[PDB]
Design a protein around this ligand. Structure first.
Ligand SMILES: O=c1ccn([C@@H]2O[C@H](COP(=O)(O)OP(=O)(O)OP(=O)(O)O)[C@@H](O)[C@H]2O)c(=O)[nH]1
Ligand SMILES: [Mg+2]
Length: 323
Protein backbone atom coordinates (compact mmCIF):
# COMPACT_ATOMS: atom_id res chain seq x y z
CA UNK A 1 0.00 0.00 0.00
CA UNK A 2 2.07 2.91 1.43
CA UNK A 3 -0.88 5.35 0.96
CA UNK A 4 -0.95 6.50 4.60
CA UNK A 5 2.84 6.72 4.78
CA UNK A 6 2.85 8.80 1.56
CA UNK A 7 0.27 11.25 2.98
CA UNK A 8 2.30 11.51 6.19
CA UNK A 9 5.51 12.15 4.18
CA UNK A 10 3.89 15.04 2.30
CA UNK A 11 2.61 16.54 5.58
CA UNK A 12 6.11 16.53 7.14
CA UNK A 13 7.62 17.79 3.86
CA UNK A 14 5.34 20.85 3.79
CA UNK A 15 6.30 21.74 7.40
CA UNK A 16 10.08 21.23 7.00
CA UNK A 17 10.72 22.83 3.61
CA UNK A 18 12.13 26.36 3.42
CA UNK A 19 9.25 28.86 3.50
CA UNK A 20 8.94 31.55 0.82
CA UNK A 21 9.59 34.15 3.54
CA UNK A 22 13.03 32.66 4.36
CA UNK A 23 14.00 32.04 0.72
CA UNK A 24 13.34 35.72 -0.07
CA UNK A 25 15.34 36.87 2.98
CA UNK A 26 18.29 34.68 1.94
CA UNK A 27 18.07 36.19 -1.56
CA UNK A 28 18.07 39.66 0.04
CA UNK A 29 21.23 38.74 2.02
CA UNK A 30 22.91 37.55 -1.18
CA UNK A 31 22.12 40.88 -2.83
CA UNK A 32 23.77 42.63 0.12
CA UNK A 33 26.89 40.43 0.09
CA UNK A 34 27.10 41.10 -3.69
CA UNK A 35 27.10 44.86 -3.02
CA UNK A 36 30.03 44.50 -0.60
CA UNK A 37 31.96 42.42 -3.15
CA UNK A 38 31.33 45.09 -5.82
CA UNK A 39 32.93 47.73 -3.59
CA UNK A 40 36.13 45.66 -3.47
CA UNK A 41 36.26 43.84 -6.83
CA UNK A 42 33.93 44.76 -9.71
CA UNK A 43 35.07 41.76 -11.84
CA UNK A 44 34.38 39.06 -9.22
CA UNK A 45 31.04 37.26 -9.01
CA UNK A 46 29.30 35.93 -5.93
CA UNK A 47 27.21 32.80 -6.49
CA UNK A 48 25.16 30.44 -4.35
CA UNK A 49 25.52 26.66 -4.44
CA UNK A 50 24.30 23.78 -2.29
CA UNK A 51 20.73 23.04 -1.25
CA UNK A 52 19.37 26.61 -1.30
CA UNK A 53 20.33 26.79 -4.98
CA UNK A 54 19.36 23.23 -5.96
CA UNK A 55 16.02 23.69 -4.18
CA UNK A 56 16.81 21.02 -1.59
CA UNK A 57 16.86 23.27 1.51
CA UNK A 58 15.19 22.71 4.84
CA UNK A 59 14.00 25.52 7.12
CA UNK A 60 16.82 27.44 8.80
CA UNK A 61 19.60 26.09 6.59
CA UNK A 62 23.13 27.48 6.25
CA UNK A 63 24.17 29.38 3.14
CA UNK A 64 26.87 28.12 0.78
CA UNK A 65 28.52 30.75 -1.43
CA UNK A 66 31.41 31.01 -3.82
CA UNK A 67 33.41 33.94 -5.21
CA UNK A 68 34.33 33.40 -8.85
CA UNK A 69 37.26 35.41 -10.18
CA UNK A 70 40.18 35.38 -12.61
CA UNK A 71 42.59 32.61 -11.51
CA UNK A 72 45.53 34.98 -12.15
CA UNK A 73 44.26 37.21 -9.31
CA UNK A 74 45.46 35.63 -6.03
CA UNK A 75 42.53 34.46 -3.92
CA UNK A 76 43.86 35.21 -0.39
CA UNK A 77 44.18 38.97 -1.08
CA UNK A 78 40.64 39.44 -2.38
CA UNK A 79 39.37 37.10 0.38
CA UNK A 80 40.96 39.35 3.00
CA UNK A 81 39.62 42.57 1.42
CA UNK A 82 36.14 41.03 1.12
CA UNK A 83 36.32 39.87 4.73
CA UNK A 84 37.28 43.37 5.96
CA UNK A 85 34.41 44.94 3.94
CA UNK A 86 31.98 42.45 5.49
CA UNK A 87 33.19 43.18 9.04
CA UNK A 88 32.80 46.92 8.29
CA UNK A 89 29.22 46.27 7.10
CA UNK A 90 28.41 44.65 10.47
CA UNK A 91 28.83 40.96 9.69
CA UNK A 92 30.63 38.78 12.20
CA UNK A 93 32.75 35.79 11.28
CA UNK A 94 36.16 34.31 10.64
CA UNK A 95 38.78 34.51 7.92
CA UNK A 96 40.81 31.33 7.62
CA UNK A 97 43.02 29.45 5.14
CA UNK A 98 43.41 25.67 4.98
CA UNK A 99 46.51 24.95 2.89
CA UNK A 100 46.08 27.16 -0.23
CA UNK A 101 42.30 27.60 0.09
CA UNK A 102 40.91 30.78 1.74
CA UNK A 103 37.49 30.60 3.47
CA UNK A 104 35.20 33.16 5.10
CA UNK A 105 32.75 31.82 7.70
CA UNK A 106 30.05 34.35 8.67
CA UNK A 107 28.18 33.52 11.90
CA UNK A 108 26.07 36.63 12.54
CA UNK A 109 24.55 39.85 11.17
CA UNK A 110 24.34 42.87 13.51
CA UNK A 111 23.18 45.65 11.13
CA UNK A 112 21.45 44.54 7.90
CA UNK A 113 18.59 42.63 9.60
CA UNK A 114 19.15 39.02 8.50
CA UNK A 115 19.57 37.56 12.00
CA UNK A 116 21.78 37.06 15.06
CA UNK A 117 22.35 33.51 13.73
CA UNK A 118 23.00 34.16 10.02
CA UNK A 119 25.24 31.26 8.97
CA UNK A 120 27.12 31.48 5.69
CA UNK A 121 30.32 29.94 4.29
CA UNK A 122 32.20 31.75 1.48
CA UNK A 123 34.72 29.85 -0.62
CA UNK A 124 36.84 31.10 -3.49
CA UNK A 125 36.82 29.49 -6.97
CA UNK A 126 35.15 26.34 -5.66
CA UNK A 127 34.00 25.56 -9.20
CA UNK A 128 33.37 21.85 -8.57
CA UNK A 129 30.70 22.57 -5.92
CA UNK A 130 28.85 24.85 -8.38
CA UNK A 131 28.90 21.97 -10.87
CA UNK A 132 27.72 19.27 -8.50
CA UNK A 133 24.92 21.72 -7.59
CA UNK A 134 23.95 22.04 -11.30
CA UNK A 135 23.71 18.23 -11.38
CA UNK A 136 21.47 17.90 -8.29
CA UNK A 137 19.36 20.80 -9.50
CA UNK A 138 18.85 19.06 -12.88
CA UNK A 139 17.60 15.87 -11.15
CA UNK A 140 15.27 18.00 -9.01
CA UNK A 141 13.67 19.37 -12.23
CA UNK A 142 13.42 15.87 -13.76
CA UNK A 143 11.16 14.24 -11.15
CA UNK A 144 9.02 15.98 -8.56
CA UNK A 145 9.51 13.16 -6.04
CA UNK A 146 13.21 13.98 -5.52
CA UNK A 147 12.83 17.17 -3.46
CA UNK A 148 10.48 15.81 -0.71
CA UNK A 149 12.44 12.54 -0.50
CA UNK A 150 15.76 14.35 0.09
CA UNK A 151 14.23 16.75 2.64
CA UNK A 152 12.73 13.84 4.56
CA UNK A 153 15.94 11.82 4.45
CA UNK A 154 17.93 14.86 5.64
CA UNK A 155 15.40 15.64 8.36
CA UNK A 156 15.56 11.95 9.42
CA UNK A 157 19.40 11.92 9.55
CA UNK A 158 19.42 15.16 11.57
CA UNK A 159 16.89 13.85 14.06
CA UNK A 160 18.80 10.58 14.49
CA UNK A 161 22.16 12.34 15.09
CA UNK A 162 23.70 10.63 12.08
CA UNK A 163 24.23 13.87 10.14
CA UNK A 164 27.43 15.06 11.92
CA UNK A 165 30.56 14.95 9.71
CA UNK A 166 32.73 16.33 12.58
CA UNK A 167 31.44 13.62 14.95
CA UNK A 168 31.97 10.46 12.88
CA UNK A 169 28.86 10.42 10.66
CA UNK A 170 27.76 11.78 7.25
CA UNK A 171 27.25 15.15 5.56
CA UNK A 172 23.85 16.05 4.12
CA UNK A 173 25.50 16.07 0.69
CA UNK A 174 26.48 12.43 1.34
CA UNK A 175 22.84 11.52 1.99
CA UNK A 176 21.70 13.31 -1.19
CA UNK A 177 24.16 11.14 -3.18
CA UNK A 178 22.92 7.99 -1.44
CA UNK A 179 19.34 8.90 -2.40
CA UNK A 180 20.38 9.63 -6.01
CA UNK A 181 22.39 6.44 -6.22
CA UNK A 182 19.33 4.50 -5.10
CA UNK A 183 17.10 6.28 -7.65
CA UNK A 184 19.50 5.74 -10.58
CA UNK A 185 21.23 2.42 -10.03
CA UNK A 186 19.17 0.38 -7.57
CA UNK A 187 15.41 0.82 -8.00
CA UNK A 188 13.73 -0.95 -10.91
CA UNK A 189 12.50 0.55 -13.14
CA UNK A 190 14.94 3.44 -12.50
CA UNK A 191 13.52 6.76 -11.30
CA UNK A 192 16.39 8.55 -13.01
CA UNK A 193 18.88 7.87 -15.81
CA UNK A 194 22.57 8.47 -15.14
CA UNK A 195 23.20 11.92 -16.67
CA UNK A 196 27.01 11.53 -16.62
CA UNK A 197 26.82 8.28 -18.61
CA UNK A 198 24.27 9.49 -21.17
CA UNK A 199 25.32 9.04 -24.80
CA UNK A 200 24.47 12.75 -25.20
CA UNK A 201 26.93 13.84 -22.48
CA UNK A 202 29.66 16.31 -23.57
CA UNK A 203 32.99 16.28 -21.72
CA UNK A 204 33.68 19.45 -19.72
CA UNK A 205 36.98 19.76 -17.83
CA UNK A 206 37.13 21.99 -14.76
CA UNK A 207 40.05 21.94 -12.28
CA UNK A 208 41.22 18.59 -13.65
CA UNK A 209 37.82 16.82 -13.48
CA UNK A 210 35.10 16.04 -16.02
CA UNK A 211 31.92 17.80 -14.92
CA UNK A 212 30.02 17.06 -18.12
CA UNK A 213 26.52 15.59 -17.92
CA UNK A 214 23.47 15.58 -20.20
CA UNK A 215 21.60 18.76 -19.26
CA UNK A 216 19.09 18.94 -22.13
CA UNK A 217 16.36 17.91 -19.71
CA UNK A 218 13.34 18.56 -21.92
CA UNK A 219 14.41 15.68 -24.24
CA UNK A 220 14.55 13.03 -21.49
CA UNK A 221 11.54 10.69 -21.19
CA UNK A 222 9.66 10.73 -17.88
CA UNK A 223 10.46 7.87 -15.48
CA UNK A 224 8.71 4.51 -15.95
CA UNK A 225 8.80 4.10 -12.18
CA UNK A 226 5.39 4.99 -10.70
CA UNK A 227 6.08 4.42 -6.98
CA UNK A 228 4.67 6.83 -4.44
CA UNK A 229 7.01 8.89 -2.24
CA UNK A 230 6.27 6.48 0.61
CA UNK A 231 7.32 3.44 -1.40
CA UNK A 232 10.47 5.14 -2.70
CA UNK A 233 11.50 6.02 0.83
CA UNK A 234 10.79 2.54 2.19
CA UNK A 235 12.81 1.02 -0.68
CA UNK A 236 15.70 3.41 0.09
CA UNK A 237 15.83 2.52 3.80
CA UNK A 238 15.63 -1.17 2.89
CA UNK A 239 18.48 -1.01 0.40
CA UNK A 240 20.91 0.66 2.82
CA UNK A 241 19.71 -1.46 5.76
CA UNK A 242 20.00 -4.93 4.20
CA UNK A 243 21.48 -5.04 0.67
CA UNK A 244 24.25 -2.44 0.34
CA UNK A 245 27.58 -3.78 1.62
CA UNK A 246 29.59 -0.83 3.04
CA UNK A 247 32.69 -2.94 3.87
CA UNK A 248 33.27 -3.88 0.22
CA UNK A 249 31.32 -1.59 -2.12
CA UNK A 250 31.39 2.06 -3.21
CA UNK A 251 28.44 4.35 -3.98
CA UNK A 252 29.28 5.59 -7.51
CA UNK A 253 27.82 7.42 -10.52
CA UNK A 254 30.59 6.25 -12.89
CA UNK A 255 29.47 2.67 -13.66
CA UNK A 256 26.63 1.65 -16.02
CA UNK A 257 25.52 -0.89 -13.39
CA UNK A 258 26.57 1.06 -10.25
CA UNK A 259 29.09 -1.65 -9.29
CA UNK A 260 32.46 -0.64 -7.80
CA UNK A 261 34.64 -2.32 -5.19
CA UNK A 262 36.72 -0.38 -2.71
CA UNK A 263 39.66 -2.44 -4.05
CA UNK A 264 39.46 -1.24 -7.68
CA UNK A 265 39.34 2.23 -6.22
CA UNK A 266 42.17 1.64 -3.71
CA UNK A 267 39.94 2.61 -0.80
CA UNK A 268 40.68 -0.04 1.87
CA UNK A 269 39.06 7.14 5.90
CA UNK A 270 37.10 4.54 3.90
CA UNK A 271 34.71 2.90 6.42
CA UNK A 272 31.93 4.24 4.19
CA UNK A 273 32.77 4.95 0.52
CA UNK A 274 30.87 7.43 -1.63
CA UNK A 275 32.73 8.52 -4.75
CA UNK A 276 31.79 12.11 -5.65
CA UNK A 277 30.29 12.10 -9.16
CA UNK A 278 32.78 14.75 -10.34
CA UNK A 279 35.70 14.88 -7.92
CA UNK A 280 36.18 11.11 -8.21
CA UNK A 281 39.23 11.13 -5.90
CA UNK A 282 37.04 12.55 -3.08
CA UNK A 283 35.35 10.08 -0.72
CA UNK A 284 32.31 12.01 0.48
CA UNK A 285 31.86 9.59 3.40
CA UNK A 286 35.47 9.97 4.60
CA UNK A 287 34.19 11.53 7.88
CA UNK A 288 32.33 8.32 8.76
CA UNK A 289 33.84 6.36 11.64
CA UNK A 290 33.38 2.72 12.58
CA UNK A 291 30.89 3.61 15.34
CA UNK A 292 29.15 6.21 13.14
CA UNK A 293 28.51 3.63 10.41
CA UNK A 294 27.13 1.22 13.00
CA UNK A 295 24.61 3.88 14.10
CA UNK A 296 23.78 4.89 10.48
CA UNK A 297 23.13 1.23 9.55
CA UNK A 298 21.20 0.66 12.81
CA UNK A 299 18.96 3.60 11.92
CA UNK A 300 18.44 2.43 8.32
CA UNK A 301 17.48 -0.94 9.87
CA UNK A 302 15.14 0.68 12.43
CA UNK A 303 13.42 2.80 9.70
CA UNK A 304 12.95 -0.34 7.58
CA UNK A 305 11.42 -2.36 10.43
CA UNK A 306 9.05 0.52 11.30
CA UNK A 307 7.73 0.70 7.72
CA UNK A 308 7.52 -3.11 7.58
CA UNK A 309 5.79 -3.38 10.97
CA UNK A 310 2.65 -5.49 11.01
CA UNK A 311 1.56 -3.91 14.31
CA UNK A 312 -1.01 -1.17 13.63
CA UNK A 313 -1.35 1.78 13.99
CA UNK A 314 2.22 2.23 12.73
CA UNK A 315 3.80 5.13 14.66
CA UNK A 316 5.21 6.89 11.54
CA UNK A 317 5.99 9.98 13.69
CA UNK A 318 8.76 7.88 15.30
CA UNK A 319 10.73 8.06 12.05
CA UNK A 320 11.49 11.71 12.94
CA UNK A 321 11.83 11.34 16.69
CA UNK A 322 15.07 12.48 18.30
CA UNK A 323 17.05 9.31 19.06
O1 LIG B 1 31.90 16.55 0.26
C1 LIG B 1 31.26 17.53 -0.10
C2 LIG B 1 30.36 18.20 0.74
C3 LIG B 1 29.78 19.39 0.29
N1 LIG B 1 29.87 19.76 -1.04
C4 LIG B 1 29.15 20.95 -1.59
O2 LIG B 1 28.66 21.74 -0.53
C5 LIG B 1 27.24 21.85 -0.60
C6 LIG B 1 26.62 21.94 0.78
O3 LIG B 1 27.00 20.81 1.55
P1 LIG B 1 26.01 20.35 2.72
O4 LIG B 1 26.53 19.13 3.35
O5 LIG B 1 25.74 21.52 3.64
O6 LIG B 1 24.73 20.03 1.83
P2 LIG B 1 23.28 20.60 2.22
O7 LIG B 1 23.17 22.02 1.84
O8 LIG B 1 22.30 19.78 1.46
O9 LIG B 1 23.14 20.32 3.66
P3 LIG B 1 22.47 21.31 4.72
O10 LIG B 1 23.44 22.47 4.70
O11 LIG B 1 21.14 21.51 4.06
O12 LIG B 1 22.45 20.52 6.00
C7 LIG B 1 26.83 20.61 -1.38
O13 LIG B 1 25.55 20.71 -1.95
C8 LIG B 1 27.93 20.57 -2.41
O14 LIG B 1 27.68 21.55 -3.42
C9 LIG B 1 30.77 19.09 -1.86
O15 LIG B 1 30.99 19.46 -3.02
N2 LIG B 1 31.45 17.99 -1.38
MG1 LIG C 1 24.88 23.56 3.43
Amino acid sequence: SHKEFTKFCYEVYNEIKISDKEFKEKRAALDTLRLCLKRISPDAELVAFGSLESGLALKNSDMDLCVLMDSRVQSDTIALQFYEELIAEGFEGKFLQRARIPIIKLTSDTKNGFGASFQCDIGFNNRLAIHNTLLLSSYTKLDARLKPMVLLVKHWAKRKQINSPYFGTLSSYGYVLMVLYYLIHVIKPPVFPNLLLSPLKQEKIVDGFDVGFDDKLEDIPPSQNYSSLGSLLHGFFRFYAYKFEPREKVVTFRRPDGYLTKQEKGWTRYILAIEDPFEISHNVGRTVSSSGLYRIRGEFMAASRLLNSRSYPIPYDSLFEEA
